[PDB]
Amino acid sequence: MSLAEKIKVLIVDDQVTSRLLLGDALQQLGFKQITAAGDGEQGMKIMAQNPHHLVISDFNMPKMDGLGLLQAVRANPATKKAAFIILTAQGDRALVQKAAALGANNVLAKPFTIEKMKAAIEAVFGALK
Fold first, then answer.
1. What angle do CA 37, 40, 42 make, to 5 degrees?
2. Are 11 and 86 a contacting pair, CB within 8 Å?
3. What is the Cβ-side half-sphere exposure of residue 23, based on CA atoms within 13 angstroms?
4. Which of 36, 68, 73, 93 is most buried as measured by Cβ atoms within 10 A of its Cβ?
5. How far apart are CA 99 and CA 32, in angstroms?
6. Which residues, 6+ apart, have CB-to-CB distance to 11 below 8 Å?
């Protein structure tokens, strides 16, 4: 809470394209401290150790995805207070909404609808639920 330390972003995906894609857009948003990892856990675990605030990864089925990520948080309150974004080369709003419903703090998707993605972020940044 002293510095950006509090705020932390993790951009890990099964493919740079996916990640670099989010990491690029995310960076264009104005994150605190972007952090890319190998994938799922490779990145999720990273956020677990260090500070996390906004997790962003691919929709793929890595070591940990919106699903695993959630259940993961449920265990750790550190991430349980952090959000997570799950997008794909296409878009799976049902997948995202699923994670959120599953029992996630805040999960946003990155489909082909700026309205969803944008509005999504507008939620994570404002409207949590």
1. 45
2. no
3. 18
4. 73
5. 24
6. 19, 22, 23, 26, 34, 35, 36, 37, 43, 56, 57
DSSP string, 27-47: HHH--S-EEEESSHHHHHHHH
Q: Where are the domains of the chain?
A: 1-129
Task: Give the type of residue at 10.
Answer: L
Q: How many residues does the chain have?
A: 129
Cα-Cα end-to-end distance for the chain: 23
Q: Residue 19 is which amino acid?
A: R
The torsion region of residue 21 among left (phi > 0), alpha (psi -120 to 50) and beta comes to: alpha
Distance of CA 97 to the CA centre of its chain: 13
Q: CATH top-level class for 1-129?
A: alpha beta
- Indicate which technique resolved this structure: NMR
